Tab-separated table of C-alpha atoms and ligand atoms in Angstrom:
chain	number	residue	atom	x	y	z
A	10	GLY	CA	109.237	138.805	102.058
A	11	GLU	CA	107.935	139.132	106.016
A	12	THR	CA	109.568	135.969	107.350
A	13	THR	CA	109.117	136.587	110.955
A	14	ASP	CA	107.276	133.915	112.662
A	15	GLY	CA	103.650	133.223	113.248
A	16	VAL	CA	100.743	132.629	112.090
A	17	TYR	CA	99.188	133.953	108.512
A	18	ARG	CA	96.048	134.000	106.038
A	19	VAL	CA	97.007	132.769	102.519
A	20	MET	CA	94.918	134.843	100.170
A	21	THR	CA	94.594	135.028	96.096
A	22	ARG	CA	93.170	137.784	93.807
A	23	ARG	CA	91.788	135.066	90.949
A	24	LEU	CA	88.777	135.349	92.493
A	25	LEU	CA	86.152	138.535	92.932
A	26	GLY	CA	88.295	140.881	94.936
A	27	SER	CA	90.578	139.325	97.957
A	28	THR	CA	89.799	136.263	98.833
A	29	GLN	CA	91.390	134.384	101.824
A	30	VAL	CA	91.536	130.569	100.591
A	31	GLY	CA	93.706	129.424	103.616
A	32	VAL	CA	95.848	129.919	106.680
A	33	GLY	CA	99.634	128.989	107.463
A	34	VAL	CA	102.404	128.509	110.847
A	35	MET	CA	105.977	130.358	109.289
A	36	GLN	CA	108.346	129.047	112.225
A	37	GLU	CA	112.339	128.370	111.785
A	38	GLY	CA	112.373	130.209	108.127
A	39	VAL	CA	109.676	127.859	106.182
A	40	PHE	CA	106.325	128.413	105.758
A	41	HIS	CA	103.872	125.396	106.399
A	42	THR	CA	99.990	125.115	105.589
A	43	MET	CA	97.328	122.218	103.451
A	44	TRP	CA	97.893	121.092	100.330
A	45	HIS	CA	94.258	121.441	99.648
A	46	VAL	CA	95.121	125.681	100.461
A	47	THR	CA	97.720	126.377	97.717
A	48	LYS	CA	97.615	122.724	95.724
A	49	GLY	CA	101.445	123.209	95.916
A	50	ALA	CA	101.307	126.654	94.157
A	51	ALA	CA	104.377	129.260	94.517
A	52	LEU	CA	103.541	131.582	97.069
A	53	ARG	CA	104.404	135.531	97.469
A	54	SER	CA	105.077	137.212	100.297
A	55	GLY	CA	105.699	140.906	99.741
A	56	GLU	CA	108.370	141.426	96.608
A	57	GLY	CA	109.198	137.656	97.339
A	58	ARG	CA	108.460	134.082	96.284
A	59	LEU	CA	107.865	131.386	98.613
A	60	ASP	CA	108.773	127.712	96.840
A	61	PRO	CA	107.418	124.950	97.675
A	62	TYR	CA	109.809	122.718	99.572
A	63	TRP	CA	107.980	119.827	100.443
A	64	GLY	CA	104.195	117.925	100.078
A	65	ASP	CA	102.076	115.013	100.341
A	66	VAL	CA	98.921	115.621	99.165
A	67	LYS	CA	97.835	112.075	101.891
A	68	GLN	CA	98.427	113.910	104.613
A	69	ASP	CA	97.276	117.002	102.911
A	70	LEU	CA	100.242	118.753	104.295
A	71	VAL	CA	103.400	121.270	102.538
A	72	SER	CA	106.338	123.522	103.554
A	73	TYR	CA	107.902	126.108	101.591
A	74	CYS	CA	111.702	127.350	101.733
A	75	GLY	CA	112.585	124.305	103.659
A	76	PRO	CA	111.498	120.825	105.550
A	77	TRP	CA	108.739	120.910	107.564
A	78	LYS	CA	110.218	122.039	111.357
A	79	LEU	CA	106.630	121.506	113.860
A	80	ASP	CA	106.805	118.591	115.533
A	81	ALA	CA	105.261	118.653	118.639
A	82	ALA	CA	101.965	116.165	119.820
A	83	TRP	CA	99.411	116.201	121.490
A	84	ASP	CA	100.063	114.451	125.063
A	85	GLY	CA	96.352	112.595	124.199
A	86	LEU	CA	95.278	114.009	127.752
A	87	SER	CA	95.102	118.092	128.155
A	88	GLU	CA	92.681	120.831	126.676
A	89	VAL	CA	93.903	122.557	123.183
A	90	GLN	CA	94.111	126.101	121.731
A	91	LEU	CA	92.716	126.084	117.627
A	92	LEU	CA	94.413	129.983	116.689
A	93	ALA	CA	91.676	130.257	114.262
A	94	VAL	CA	92.071	133.152	112.002
A	95	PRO	CA	88.464	133.011	110.447
A	96	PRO	CA	88.004	134.988	106.459
A	97	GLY	CA	88.205	138.542	107.323
A	98	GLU	CA	87.658	138.308	111.112
A	99	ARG	CA	90.702	138.577	113.543
A	100	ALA	CA	92.610	135.788	115.404
A	101	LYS	CA	90.719	133.917	117.892
A	102	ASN	CA	92.178	131.220	120.063
A	103	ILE	CA	89.302	129.064	121.455
A	104	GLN	CA	90.139	125.974	123.295
A	105	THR	CA	89.240	122.459	124.042
A	106	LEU	CA	89.563	118.727	124.740
A	107	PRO	CA	90.230	116.923	121.867
A	108	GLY	CA	88.315	113.784	120.850
A	109	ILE	CA	89.972	110.709	118.733
A	110	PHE	CA	89.804	109.709	115.287
A	111	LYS	CA	90.571	105.765	115.046
A	112	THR	CA	92.203	104.703	111.914
A	113	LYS	CA	93.704	101.386	110.605
A	114	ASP	CA	97.246	103.055	111.310
A	115	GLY	CA	96.450	104.220	114.422
A	116	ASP	CA	95.117	107.115	116.443
A	117	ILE	CA	95.157	110.684	115.743
A	118	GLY	CA	93.758	113.669	117.991
A	119	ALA	CA	90.574	115.168	116.594
A	120	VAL	CA	89.104	118.740	117.377
A	121	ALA	CA	85.005	119.529	116.573
A	122	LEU	CA	85.143	122.728	116.265
A	123	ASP	CA	83.373	124.948	112.659
A	124	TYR	CA	84.926	127.636	110.880
A	125	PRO	CA	84.930	128.354	107.028
A	126	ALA	CA	86.523	126.381	104.754
A	127	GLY	CA	89.161	129.267	104.195
A	128	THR	CA	90.076	128.668	108.172
A	129	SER	CA	92.001	125.304	106.874
A	130	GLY	CA	95.449	125.299	107.819
A	131	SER	CA	94.934	127.388	111.403
A	132	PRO	CA	97.611	125.686	114.196
A	133	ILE	CA	96.383	123.613	117.049
A	134	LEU	CA	98.504	124.509	120.382
A	135	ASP	CA	99.326	122.825	123.360
A	136	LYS	CA	99.949	125.070	126.616
A	137	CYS	CA	103.209	125.641	126.142
A	138	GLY	CA	102.722	127.823	122.625
A	139	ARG	CA	103.744	124.686	120.650
A	140	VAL	CA	101.915	123.714	117.280
A	141	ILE	CA	101.021	120.665	117.479
A	142	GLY	CA	99.227	119.971	114.048
A	143	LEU	CA	96.885	122.155	111.450
A	144	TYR	CA	93.427	122.635	111.298
A	145	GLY	CA	91.345	122.169	108.275
A	146	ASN	CA	91.508	118.076	107.333
A	147	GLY	CA	88.986	116.185	108.723
A	148	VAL	CA	85.272	114.511	108.297
A	149	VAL	CA	81.209	115.674	108.698
A	150	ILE	CA	79.328	113.224	111.205
A	151	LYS	CA	75.556	112.461	111.444
A	152	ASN	CA	74.161	115.564	112.506
A	153	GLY	CA	75.757	117.860	110.011
A	154	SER	CA	78.667	119.362	112.202
A	155	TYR	CA	82.704	119.305	111.016
A	156	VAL	CA	85.127	117.088	113.255
A	157	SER	CA	89.108	117.968	111.968
A	158	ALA	CA	91.996	116.095	112.350
A	159	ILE	CA	94.686	117.759	114.244
A	160	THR	CA	97.315	116.841	111.491
A	161	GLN	CA	101.176	117.303	111.945
A	162	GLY	CA	103.553	116.388	109.700
A	163	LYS	CA	107.302	114.634	110.157
A	164	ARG	CA	110.691	116.785	111.214
A	165	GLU	CA	113.082	114.634	109.416
B	2	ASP	CA	98.551	133.991	92.310
B	3	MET	CA	98.425	133.965	96.120
B	4	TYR	CA	100.247	136.204	98.866
B	5	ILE	CA	100.560	135.567	102.748
B	6	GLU	CA	99.763	138.538	105.480
B	7	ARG	CA	100.697	138.274	108.974
B	8	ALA	CA	97.782	137.115	111.240
B	9	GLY	CA	99.846	137.094	114.983
B	10	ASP	CA	101.785	135.690	117.069
B	11	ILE	CA	101.437	131.742	118.059
B	12	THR	CA	100.542	131.715	122.059
B	13	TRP	CA	98.345	130.042	124.296
B	14	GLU	CA	95.445	132.705	126.015
B	15	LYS	CA	94.599	132.206	129.433
B	16	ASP	CA	91.004	132.483	129.579
B	17	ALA	CA	90.373	131.946	125.875
B	18	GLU	CA	86.839	130.799	124.675
B	19	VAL	CA	86.343	126.749	125.736
B	20	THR	CA	84.004	124.944	123.956
B	21	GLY	CA	83.329	122.146	121.638
B	22	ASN	CA	82.507	117.903	122.171
B	23	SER	CA	85.487	115.279	121.861
B	24	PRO	CA	84.042	112.276	119.703
B	25	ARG	CA	85.603	108.939	119.802
B	26	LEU	CA	85.411	108.526	115.870
B	27	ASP	CA	86.645	105.050	113.130
B	28	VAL	CA	87.703	106.417	110.240
B	29	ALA	CA	89.343	106.118	107.234
B	30	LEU	CA	92.334	107.815	105.162
B	31	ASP	CA	92.424	107.799	101.675
B	32	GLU	CA	95.566	107.569	98.848
B	33	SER	CA	93.413	111.287	98.368
B	34	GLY	CA	93.891	112.698	101.293
B	35	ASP	CA	89.878	112.452	101.901
B	36	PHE	CA	88.615	111.339	105.683
B	37	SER	CA	85.258	109.219	105.447
B	38	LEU	CA	83.461	107.129	108.402
B	39	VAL	CA	83.722	103.617	109.091
B	40	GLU	CA	80.049	102.390	109.935
C	213	LIG	C1	98.874	109.126	112.025
C	213	LIG	C2	98.014	108.949	110.706
C	213	LIG	O1	98.532	109.366	109.564
C	213	LIG	C3	99.681	110.263	108.827
C	213	LIG	C4	100.913	109.993	109.718
C	213	LIG	C5	102.261	110.861	109.332
C	213	LIG	C6	102.060	111.879	109.646
C	213	LIG	C7	100.418	112.564	108.792
C	213	LIG	C8	99.242	111.798	109.146
C	213	LIG	C9	98.006	111.907	108.886
C	213	LIG	N1	97.024	112.404	108.194
C	213	LIG	C10	96.878	108.097	110.437
C	213	LIG	N2	96.031	107.732	109.517
C	213	LIG	O2	96.894	107.585	111.642
C	214	LIG	C1	82.481	120.393	105.605
C	214	LIG	C2	83.381	121.298	105.315
C	214	LIG	O1	84.210	122.416	106.180
C	214	LIG	C3	85.074	122.648	106.415
C	214	LIG	C4	86.520	122.492	105.787
C	214	LIG	C5	87.668	122.660	106.686
C	214	LIG	C6	87.746	123.190	107.330
C	214	LIG	C7	86.302	123.676	107.953
C	214	LIG	C8	85.632	123.194	107.927
C	214	LIG	C9	84.638	122.864	108.564
C	214	LIG	N1	83.399	123.636	108.962
C	214	LIG	C10	83.361	121.790	103.646
C	214	LIG	N2	83.200	122.854	103.645
C	214	LIG	O2	83.247	120.798	102.746
């Protein structure tokens, strides 16, 4: 199938028409997405098959065809861009200054941008075009608006 | 059955729309990978 680096929509035909359940990143021959998007299921790319290779429900991440390759990190100071790929809409870069999720195990960058649930897995980029994490696992705050963690894996 | 379709290159866009605030939130992450607000 298609193995070119880039952002991809994750689609399904199980429901009405063709529905976008999420997004992912192809880099170094490995497809990266959020676990809640595929639930660890196999994927199709044209005639080819992508099998899961690594996954973790707690991190909410999964990789296909090989190990997790994304290791860039938010520097804690600079603006970033969400490369949002919404259902039925063109890919679009949105620049923002991340906030912070403070946890008992440390701080994580967070992006306060609201998109349909089928946008989960869209990458967050630094100024060099490197993926520092994926959008789509977060919380709903006081006002009802959404804030996503900048979710990043570990490159072994 | 799930399938993937290319949607673009991964590139920083000069002069992209700038939006969103930067909240500092106390959060917890459970075994199911769900975030919650700590208050
Ligand atoms: C850093 C973050 O936990 C992780 C650790 C490693 C990889 C992903 C995540 C997530 N999500 C935390 N809760 O402090
Ligand atoms: C509140 C939550 O929304 C999202 C989930 C994942 C990714 C983006 C959003 C947004 N916006 C939901 N649908 O329950």
